[PDB]
Amino acid sequence: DSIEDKNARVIELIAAYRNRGHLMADIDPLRLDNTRFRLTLWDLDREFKVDGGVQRKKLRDILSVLRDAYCRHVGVEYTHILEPEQQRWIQERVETKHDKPTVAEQKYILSKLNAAEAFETFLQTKYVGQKRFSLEGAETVIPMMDAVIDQCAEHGLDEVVIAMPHRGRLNVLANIVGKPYSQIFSEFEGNLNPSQAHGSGDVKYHLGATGTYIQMFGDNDIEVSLTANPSHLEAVDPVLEGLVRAKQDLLDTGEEGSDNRFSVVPLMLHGDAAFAGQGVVAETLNLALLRGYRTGGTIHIVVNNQIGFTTAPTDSRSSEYCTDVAKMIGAPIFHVNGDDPEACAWVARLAVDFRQAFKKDVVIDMLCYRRRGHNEGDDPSMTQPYMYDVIDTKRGSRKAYTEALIGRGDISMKEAEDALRDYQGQLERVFNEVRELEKHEIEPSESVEADQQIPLATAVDKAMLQRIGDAHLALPEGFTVHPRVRPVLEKRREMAYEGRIDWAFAELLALGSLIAEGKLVRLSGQDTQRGTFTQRHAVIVDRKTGEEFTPLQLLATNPDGTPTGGKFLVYNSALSEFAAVGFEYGYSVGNPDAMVLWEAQFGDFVNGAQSIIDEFISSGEAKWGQLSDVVLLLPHGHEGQGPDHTSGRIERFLQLWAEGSMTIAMPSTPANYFHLLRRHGKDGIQRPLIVFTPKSMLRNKAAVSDIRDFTESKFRSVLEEPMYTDGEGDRNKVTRLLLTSGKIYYELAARKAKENREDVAIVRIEQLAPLPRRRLAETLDRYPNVKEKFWVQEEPANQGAWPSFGLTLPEILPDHFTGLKRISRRAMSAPSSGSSKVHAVEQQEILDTAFG
Amino acid sequence: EDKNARVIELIAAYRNRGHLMADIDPLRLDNTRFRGLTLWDLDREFKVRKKLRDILSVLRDAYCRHVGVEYTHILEPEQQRWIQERVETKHDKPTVAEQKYILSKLNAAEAFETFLQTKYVGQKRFSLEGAETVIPMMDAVIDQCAEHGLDEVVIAMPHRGRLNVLANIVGKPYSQIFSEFEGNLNPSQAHGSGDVKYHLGATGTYIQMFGDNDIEVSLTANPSHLEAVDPVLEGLVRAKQDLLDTGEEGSDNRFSVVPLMLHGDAAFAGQGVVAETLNLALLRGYRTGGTIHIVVNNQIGFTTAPTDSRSSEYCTDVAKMIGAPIFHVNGDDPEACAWVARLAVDFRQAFKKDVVIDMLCYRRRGHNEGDDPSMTQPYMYDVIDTKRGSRKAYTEALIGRGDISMKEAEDALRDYQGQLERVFNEVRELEKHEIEPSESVEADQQIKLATAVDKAMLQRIGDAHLALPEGFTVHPRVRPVLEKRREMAYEGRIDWAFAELLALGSLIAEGKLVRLSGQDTQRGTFTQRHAVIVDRKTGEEFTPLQLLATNPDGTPTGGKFLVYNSALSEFAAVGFEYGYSVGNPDAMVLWEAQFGDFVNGAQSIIDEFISSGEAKWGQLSDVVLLLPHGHEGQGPDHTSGRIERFLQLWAEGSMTIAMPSTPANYFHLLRRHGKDGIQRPLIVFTPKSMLRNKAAVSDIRDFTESKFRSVLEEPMYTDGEGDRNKVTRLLLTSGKIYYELAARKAKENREDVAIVRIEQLAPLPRRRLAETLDRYPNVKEKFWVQEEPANQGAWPSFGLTLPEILPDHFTGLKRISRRAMSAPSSGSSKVHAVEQQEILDTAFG
Numbered sequence A: 001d002s003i004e005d006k007n008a009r010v011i012e013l014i015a016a017y018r019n020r021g022h023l024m025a026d027i028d029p030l031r032l033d034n035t036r037f038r039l040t041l042w043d044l045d046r047e048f049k050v051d052g053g054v055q056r057k058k059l060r061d062i063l064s065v066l067r068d069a070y071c072r073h074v075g076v077e078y079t080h081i082l083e084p085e086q087q088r089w090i091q092e093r094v095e096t097k098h099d100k101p102t103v104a105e106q107k108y109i110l111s112k113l114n115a116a117e118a119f120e121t122f123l124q125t126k127y128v129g130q131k132r133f134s135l136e137g138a139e140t141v142i143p144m145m146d147a148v149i150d151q152c153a154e155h156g157l158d159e160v161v162i163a164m165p166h167r168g169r170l171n172v173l174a175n176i177v178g179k180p181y182s183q184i185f186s187e188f189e190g191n192l193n194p195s196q197a198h199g200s201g202d203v204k205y206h207l208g209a210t211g212t213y214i215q216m217f218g219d220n221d222i223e224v225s226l227t228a229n230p231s232h233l234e235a236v237d238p239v240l241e242g243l244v245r246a247k248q249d250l251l252d253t254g255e256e257g258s259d260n261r262f263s264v265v266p267l268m269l270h271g272d273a274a275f276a277g278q279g280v281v282a283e284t285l286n287l288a289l290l291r292g293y294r295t296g297g298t299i300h301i302v303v304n305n306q307i308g309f310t311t312a313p314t315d316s317r318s319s320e321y322c323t324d325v326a327k328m329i330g331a332p333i334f335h336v337n338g339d340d341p342e343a344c345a346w347v348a349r350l351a352v353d354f355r356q357a358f359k360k361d362v363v364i365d366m367l368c369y370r371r372r373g374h375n376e377g378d379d380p381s382m383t384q385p386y387m388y389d390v391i392d393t394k395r396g397s398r399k400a401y402t403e404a405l406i407g408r409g410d411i412s413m414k415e416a417e418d419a420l421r422d423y424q425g426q427l428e429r430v431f432n433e434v435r436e437l438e439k440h441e442i443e444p445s446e447s448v449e450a451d452q453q454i455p456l457a458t459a460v461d462k463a464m465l466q467r468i469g470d471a472h473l474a475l476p477e478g479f480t481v482h483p484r485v486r487p488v489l490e491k492r493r494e495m496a497y498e499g500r501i502d503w504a505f506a507e508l509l510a511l512g513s514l515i516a517e518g519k520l521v522r523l524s525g526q527d528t529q530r531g532t533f534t535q536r537h538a539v540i541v542d543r544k545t546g547e548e549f550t551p552l553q554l555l556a557t558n559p560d561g562t563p564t565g566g567k568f569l570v571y572n573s574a575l576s577e578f579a580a581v582g583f584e585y586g587y588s589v590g591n592p593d594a595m596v597l598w599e600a601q602f603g604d605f606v607n608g609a610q611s612i613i614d615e616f617i618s619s620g621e622a623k624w625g626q627l628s629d630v631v632l633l634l635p636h637g638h639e640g641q642g643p644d645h646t647s648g649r650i651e652r653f654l655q656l657w658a659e660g661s662m663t664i665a666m667p668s669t670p671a672n673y674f675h676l677l678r679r680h681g682k683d684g685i686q687r688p689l690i691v692f693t694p695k696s697m698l699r700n701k702a703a704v705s706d707i708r709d710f711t712e713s714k715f716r717s718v719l720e721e722p723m724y725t726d727g728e729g730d731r732n733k734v735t736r737l738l739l740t741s742g743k744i745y746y747e748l749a750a751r752k753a754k755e756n757r758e759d760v761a762i763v764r765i766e767q768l769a770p771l772p773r774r775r776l777a778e779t780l781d782r783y784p785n786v787k788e789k790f791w792v793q794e795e796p797a798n799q800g801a802w803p804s805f806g807l808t809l810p811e812i813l814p815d816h817f818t819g820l821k822r823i824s825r826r827a828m829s830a831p832s833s834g835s836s837k838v839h840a841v842e843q844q845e846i847l848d849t850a851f852g
Numbered sequence B: 001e002d003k004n005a006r007v008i009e010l011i012a013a014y015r016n017r018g019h020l021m022a023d024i025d026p027l028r029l030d031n032t033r034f035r036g037l038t039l040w041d042l043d044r045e046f047k048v049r050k051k052l053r054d055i056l057s058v059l060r061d062a063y064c065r066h067v068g069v070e071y072t073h074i075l076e077p078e079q080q081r082w083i084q085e086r087v088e089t090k091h092d093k094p095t096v097a098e099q100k101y102i103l104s105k106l107n108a109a110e111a112f113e114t115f116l117q118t119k120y121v122g123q124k125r126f127s128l129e130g131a132e133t134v135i136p137m138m139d140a141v142i143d144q145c146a147e148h149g150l151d152e153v154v155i156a157m158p159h160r161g162r163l164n165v166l167a168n169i170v171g172k173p174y175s176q177i178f179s180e181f182e183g184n185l186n187p188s189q190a191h192g193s194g195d196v197k198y199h200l201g202a203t204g205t206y207i208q209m210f211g212d213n214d215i216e217v218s219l220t221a222n223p224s225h226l227e228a229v230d231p232v233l234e235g236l237v238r239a240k241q242d243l244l245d246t247g248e249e250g251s252d253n254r255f256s257v258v259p260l261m262l263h264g265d266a267a268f269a270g271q272g273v274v275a276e277t278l279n280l281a282l283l284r285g286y287r288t289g290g291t292i293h294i295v296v297n298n299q300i301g302f303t304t305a306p307t308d309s310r311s312s313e314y315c316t317d318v319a320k321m322i323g324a325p326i327f328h329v330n331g332d333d334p335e336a337c338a339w340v341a342r343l344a345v346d347f348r349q350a351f352k353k354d355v356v357i358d359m360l361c362y363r364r365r366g367h368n369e370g371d372d373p374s375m376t377q378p379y380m381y382d383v384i385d386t387k388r389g390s391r392k393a394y395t396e397a398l399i400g401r402g403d404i405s406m407k408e409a410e411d412a413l414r415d416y417q418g419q420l421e422r423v424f425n426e427v428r429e430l431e432k433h434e435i436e437p438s439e440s441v442e443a444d445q446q447i448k449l450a451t452a453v454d455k456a457m458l459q460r461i462g463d464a465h466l467a468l469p470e471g472f473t474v475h476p477r478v479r480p481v482l483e484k485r486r487e488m489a490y491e492g493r494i495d496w497a498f499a500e501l502l503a504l505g506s507l508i509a510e511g512k513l514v515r516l517s518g519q520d521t522q523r524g525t526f527t528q529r530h531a532v533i534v535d536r537k538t539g540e541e542f543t544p545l546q547l548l549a550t551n552p553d554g555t556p557t558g559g560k561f562l563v564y565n566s567a568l569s570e571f572a573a574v575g576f577e578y579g580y581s582v583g584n585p586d587a588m589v590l591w592e593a594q595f596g597d598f599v600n601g602a603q604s605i606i607d608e609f610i611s612s613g614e615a616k617w618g619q620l621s622d623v624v625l626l627l628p629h630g631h632e633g634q635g636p637d638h639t640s641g642r643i644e645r646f647l648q649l650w651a652e653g654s655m656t657i658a659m660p661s662t663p664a665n666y667f668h669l670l671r672r673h674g675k676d677g678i679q680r681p682l683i684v685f686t687p688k689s690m691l692r693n694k695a696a697v698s699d700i701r702d703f704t705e706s707k708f709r710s711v712l713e714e715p716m717y718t719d720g721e722g723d724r725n726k727v728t729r730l731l732l733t734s735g736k737i738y739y740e741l742a743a744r745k746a747k748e749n750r751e752d753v754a755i756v757r758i759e760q761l762a763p764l765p766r767r768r769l770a771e772t773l774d775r776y777p778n779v780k781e782k783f784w785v786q787e788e789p790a791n792q793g794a795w796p797s798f799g800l801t802l803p804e805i806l807p808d809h810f811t812g813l814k815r816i817s818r819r820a821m822s823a824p825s826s827g828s829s830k831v832h833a834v835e836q837q838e839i840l841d842t843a844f845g
């Protein structure tokens, strides 16, 4: 009504654009949604109060600033950000006049759209019947990624690490990372050399590459990497993060680094349907600001072609944008029109600037379209006739941008034509040279087992064990240890000097000795600092102040004061399995010289990371030549705590095992666990280790080891009873042999002692995979009067080691294992019964059968 | 002049950021939480005409007291306005009777926990102490649902106060919870292998204390795997809504079945399935009309601080992805908690959208009742030890307000304590049963079932593909599918894709509800299904099988065809379909993977629900998993449905596992599954290239006069001029490799070799297999042949079980397969072809 009323209506209008302007922005190059674009006129020329300091601006000028910033080809979502300094930063860079690119920069963008579109048309011409998951309709991704990388080089960063799905993957490999065209062309020809034909392999749009990006207008260079992935969309997201964090830790940058540059940048590409539908996206975003996982912000690019094969976005998500999940971490989101390559390159540079300023994730939603079917052989008008009727009228971004550069007089029609002829002439020359190569004979894929051959002294000095023991009592000045934590630290110093070392200390003796030798040790998982079973105490919390103390971190310094090079990185993970296991797998790939251990609360929850186990951990070497030394610690054992607190599903890991891809163990003694970890960290082999770890056996007084087992011994794949190797036991009295693995040994041994059964022997198989054939055959030959052999296990008949051992043992060793029978629980649907009482009755039946 | 503009920006600051200043944490852990207009402006009237003092007092009460409101992220302005109007007004104080009722809820909640502490000090119970307000809050949710006249509230929750909720909300007898702690279960409770006490469910009828309405209250079973039950709950509710003719597939838009989903703060932010389930909230094939979420935010995850649990301010920030309003409420204010719970139900009823309540509280004891939390959280537990619980604090406010006396409050606790002791003593007095090992559930559900249909039924389903609406324009490449199907229905040579629709269509015609979903399932990954056809000119949809829901005389059959394109999820989508089948046991529920290689994204559902739910909880599901499978040279992720993993999981006849080789056999497998009366999941390994194999077709008689065949012989012996006595080598197989072996046998005229197919992989068809092999008396060698690597396919289980169940028939059985491999296959189609030819050469060499 009045001046005070009018000025208040302007402030509401200013906030509506900043909050909701993106809903009116011309971001969709297809204009599919018809209803998208659903105070007096005398007040437009009046001057209003604006806090920008405070200045007086005409309503028309305020309005035009808001429309240009928020309602053109860029939809900006940032008012959900809780940090006011971040809202101010974006608001200042978005609500100002943007400097137009130079003619040279515009021409360079055009060259990126030329290379992008002519690569996809050349492939449509030469290999019309092969899938390539074309980037056609989304060519703007290439100048956009180029701008991200160029802006990272402009900030003087060290590396950009990419992860992406199928969409434009080959295009990115060739035009961004620098994968030779000849290599891509040789893949389509299906003529691979012995190096490319190694292992079982994988499809062309799953492969990675490395290279050096050189600035076109600047004087800096930056490393560009692209990591391998399975078909399983978004599964590589935590793997990328782990890989980057491992690289950042090595360059002394980021969270565990001297500077706060986070000089290794994750550039993560996504499809619009997969970004909203896959849970691992939220799991990986949730890691973005965590101390144990932060990479200083990820640059996310969503190639939003408004389709998921035949599925419309309406059936893909319950939200306006495919990127709305990124709001959970307060990430700014830029929705940009794919037909405006200049707006796309500008948003990409703004994204990198935001990441560098706040060490936080940024999401770019590139609205585009998919010119062809889902694959190049699919007909999309069957399911999307309206969308494909609009695409057929649509001139590509390259043709449109070419017509803009000719209009602006920047280039001629001849220069534009000649540049396309040059590019297609170059591809034809390389395609012909590749086709001219002599064709190799196709042979069946071969096992990778022999690609990595085992050398190994894992025994340490008594002074080493004592130093790790002393570290547990080398408390900072005035530190107050919790009264129930103090006996663990004192009992460990006692263990290190007097023996009877339990499982929990043997683990820290292994990790501590590696740190002392200069190894980087990364240990993480749910409540891993203290330990689920209050056993580890890798970090101790001051009772009065809350201050933390990490005893093994003292092993990173030599007694002469110099560093060993080693480090202890121990964290409490978020409540995730998929992202946490993926991250640790990626971390080991990123730093092959690191000791990387991930611990499940109980092995029963590792099935939440099944895609990582199946697609990365068990098969990555055979498929991509990608090596990982990740350790999975899986608390396992029948103790009456129910079907979810019992099994790490040993049978599933043994089923997945082939070609010596992983080591699978279930050690029964602390010393054997110690040597297993040291062998894994020192063998020079990069292969995952699956360890089935104890729960109650952690506090079993029989399950302790002598100092000489650490100082003058090595890993034992097969273990005999101490009464035969160190005692006065007679092996020739044995008629029944019991073959087992894990904690059930101690129960069988206690029953043997109670009944003085000299006729029965118990042999433990510590290394489940690869089977210790030679050592097992030698061991059995030491018992010549054996008339019957039984595989004994607490696990149901369809679980544990029996499904694989019952088939493999009589086949690999027919002389020793023909007639081998099973003693176990019945086959069960669940890993165990829900009642502790019923567990006890079943457990006693097993030992009665084994001795009856 | 500028003042009125600062007032509007200030109003906006409270609505936008006021929740960051709200006194929501009952522990006040964060010390720094509470950090253009004059004091003269407070009495002046401003444009929103209201005085500044009244404007600020309304903004403080609504946004900065015990309730933190997040709603300005909501894109629908009418939803922001709805919240605004209900939050920025004077709230009517509860009556003395209502306050007393809230106190009775906190009394029951806290005394149940202190009683279990006293009697069973050494047993885990994941106590609700420090979070007791959850009970009056859930009561308010359920009471508000009854006030809206809804039919049922279905709950899913984790361990935190599960026992308490069961006893004080659902109405599970105290005697039953006490018998569980005693460890003395009757034959009915000791059935199957079972599960732990805080995994079990219950059902009951809630009766309003002050109203005249009643509502059903259910609590569903779940594993330890936190949040895994979230999509299962949604599926269960959607199946119930579809039965009540409410919701998306109902005549009314009431969605009268309400999901009430409880969460722990660390699991809500860390588990991806949360985002996957939220993503389903407004989808046509999955919407339940909004879920009421209650996060029991005790600001701890066992020993893990929230700083290591999430990268955001609140544990509930993932719910912003679907524009859900979030209410952060102080757990020490049970009245604010009950009021927010009723507001939540009112928002769900108005907008058919999810609402999230973040109940800020604390965990009085350790993670479990035996854990010492001061080892890792000494500051937090030093603050908890000074804190008086919510029950004692609310009691003191009620004696202060003059509402109750100290005697009435004391006497009410003595009454509750006396009642619990009386029930505990009666339970302890019961005769103790002998503990025996758990038994297989195989015999709990016992199966000659006629699955054949009349030819007039095949013809009707064929005609339905051509019974197009007036003026409908079929895509030129879709029209031959429709016409070839009407030809197939009358002339035979029925392919796989049509045999599927013949099965689903005949069930619909018989009155069955059919739900089919998965990624690109309406058209089909291999462009073969066309369950829905899209008008080339208008985009309008036509579903041919939906015509089978009406009889020729115009009356309905009772059947329905619900076919959807799922979101790009496996975990949530498989969980949802499992829960749908549990919710409606009379429905035919099929979920289809794009390729079986992606079902490992739903591994927790397969492991924790599908394969073991019957043995653990007595929870039955008839869910069908369709898994496209087969070695064709498309790489390690487009080849295997990991058959070896499903066979490994199989035990106690929990599931049926099949790999049919013919359309007719697939048809009868689906019809047997839908008509057998048994509620057990069906795992089907389905074809890709075999869909278009001209040898893989069936006759009309195979549908009208035959039945499911667990084992199949070559047609040359059953219908041709082949001599079984000439056979010396027998090849045992399953799936598409049969046709390749059969083509090699014909090419070489190998009468000495026979190929026998095992269609039903689990349970193994012992009798038929032995009866079939007995027809080949001159067999000198038997081989299990498979295209899958040695450590994959059926060999790992069959190589061990076949010589054991049939020693006379299978002793000396050898394997013909690919070598053991880390990946399900090679990446090169050329290398695949070389390996495939080696198998064929070995089998015939």
Ligand SMILES: Cc1ncc(C[n+]2c([C@H](O)CCCC(=O)O)sc(CCOP(=O)(O)OP(=O)(O)O)c2C)c(N)n1
Residues within 6 Å of the ligand: A133, A165, A166, A167, A203, A205, A230, A231, A232, A233, A270, A271, A272, A273, A274, A275, A303, A305, A307, A308, A309, A370, A374, B519, B568, B594, B598, B601, B637
């Ligand atoms: C977990 C999981 N569940 C299912 C699939 C099957 N699936 C995909 C392919 O099979 C892999 C493609 C090629 C390969 O790598 O082998 S793509 C697709 C459409 C995705 O669309 P979007 O909108 O995200 O991307 P676009 O529009 O396509 O750019 C679906 C459903 C999968 N790969 N992973």
Ligand SMILES: Cc1ncc(C[n+]2c([C@H](O)CCCC(=O)O)sc(CCOP(=O)(O)OP(=O)(O)O)c2C)c(N)n1
Residues within 6 Å of the ligand: A526, A575, A576, A601, A605, A608, A644, A645, B159, B160, B196, B198, B223, B224, B225, B226, B263, B264, B265, B266, B267, B268, B271, B296, B298, B300, B301, B302, B363, B367
């Ligand atoms: C996927 C998955 N990964 C790990 C676990 C192990 N885990 C849990 C238990 O084992 C389940 C409890 C016992 C049982 O049901 O058997 S609770 C927990 C802490 C919960 O934090 P929160 O803040 O969310 O809950 P509260 O504060 O406690 O109310 C973790 C880590 C799991 N069950 N599921």
Ligand SMILES: [Ca+2]
Residues within 6 Å of the ligand: A629, A679, A680, A681, A682, A683, A684, A685, A686, A687
């Ligand atoms: Ca190694």
Ligand SMILES: [Ca+2]
Residues within 6 Å of the ligand: B622, B672, B673, B674, B675, B676, B677, B678, B679, B680
């Ligand atoms: Ca059934």
Ligand SMILES: [Mg+2]
Residues within 6 Å of the ligand: A271, A272, A273, A303, A304, A305, A306, A307, A308, A309
């Ligand atoms: Mg897409």
Ligand SMILES: [Mg+2]
Residues within 6 Å of the ligand: B264, B265, B266, B296, B297, B298, B299, B300, B301, B302
């Ligand atoms: Mg918690």
